[PDB]
Nucleic acid binder design. Structure first.
Ligand SMILES: [Zn+2]
Lengths: 207, 49
RNA sequence: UGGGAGAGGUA
DNA sequence: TATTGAATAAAATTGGGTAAATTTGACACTATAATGGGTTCGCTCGTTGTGGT
């Protein structure tokens, strides 16, 4: 909708290659007032802006901001999950830290993650069926059967499980799926929710 | 330039280190008012698009 | 857009 | 009266390979005779290495 133009604007100055430049007007916007509007829209909807900049690897310092906001949300929301609600203070802080970091890395994982692109489709998730081109004449496409359309290898949730059972050893996989993993999926759904509400507030500001 | 009635005296530090204090009648009578003509251009070029 | 020369000038 | 660990089946992933498309890079266009190039200074002063009786 509105947010990805700002991610275009976080780059350095790229060289132009065209004819007569410099419209010199206020047709869309400048490049500094977009950052000023990001500043005006930070007192509310800062979670989604921090998560979006951490996801798209522009301003690689608000990854820790997004992990801290997710940790605060998990501290506020942990009173409805039976596996985490009985633990003691610093141990519950450390399990919330480790599953917040893994949930944020799962939200961040797209086809630009190093070691995550599909082998066949090279990320596009769209290969050409040769038989339908031979019978139709025109060029066709299909779904990349190895990646199954998404274009990248998804993050398995058991990585957080392996990283928490170095700290909680007596927590096996069935109770991990029963009363811990809903909190992890709640964290990634909260990341997507905060990014959507930040895009909504950005579009409300720069309108 | 113009011939200016000039007094040689320090005036409250307003001519401190090679500074000049000027009456408002020199600005009213428009004595040192200069005209500055400036040329802007606009070229209509043949873009390949 | 934005780089390099050359010339002159101000403190 | 639940909840949880062992087992489990289905689905996603992964490393390897593989036959078949397909892309890459290189070529290719032909006869009278013809046979060794155009740059650079009044533009001071200290240092340092390299070469020389
Ligand atoms: Zn694929």
């Amino acid at each position: 909708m509105r947010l990805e133009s700002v991610a275009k604007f976080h780059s350095p100055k790229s060289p132009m290659m065209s004819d007569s430049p410099r419209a010199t007007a206020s047709d869309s916007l400048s490049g500094t007032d977009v950052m000023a509007a990001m500043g005006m829209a930070q007192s509310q909807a800062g979670f989604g802006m921090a998560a979006f900049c951490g996801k798209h690897e522009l301003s690689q310092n608000d990854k820790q901001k997004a992990i801290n906001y997710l940790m605060q949300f998990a501290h506020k929301v942990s009173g409805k999950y039976r596996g985490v609600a009985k633990l003691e203070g610093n141990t519950k802080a450390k399990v919330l830290q480790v599953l917040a970091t893994f949930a944020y890395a799962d939200y961040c994982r797209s086809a630009a993650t190093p070691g995550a692109r599909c082998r066949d489709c090279h990320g596009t998730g769209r290969a050409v069926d040769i038989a339908k081109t031979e019978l139709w004449g025109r060029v066709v496409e299909k779904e990349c059967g190895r990646c199954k359309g998404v274009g990248y290898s998804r993050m398995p949730a058991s990585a957080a499980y392996r990283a928490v059972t170095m700290l909680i050893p007596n927590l096996t996989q069935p109770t991990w799926s029963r009363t811990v993993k809903p909190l992890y999926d709640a964290l990634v759904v909260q990341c997507h929710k905060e990014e959507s509400i930040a895009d909504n507030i950005l579009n409300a500001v720069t309108r | 330039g113009q011939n200016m009635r000039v007094a040689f005296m320090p005036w409250n530090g307003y001519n401190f280190e090679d500074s000049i204090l000027v009456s408002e009648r020199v600005v009213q009578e428009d004595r040192f008012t200069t005209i500055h003509i400036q040329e802007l251009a606009c070229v209509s070029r043949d873009t390949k698009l």
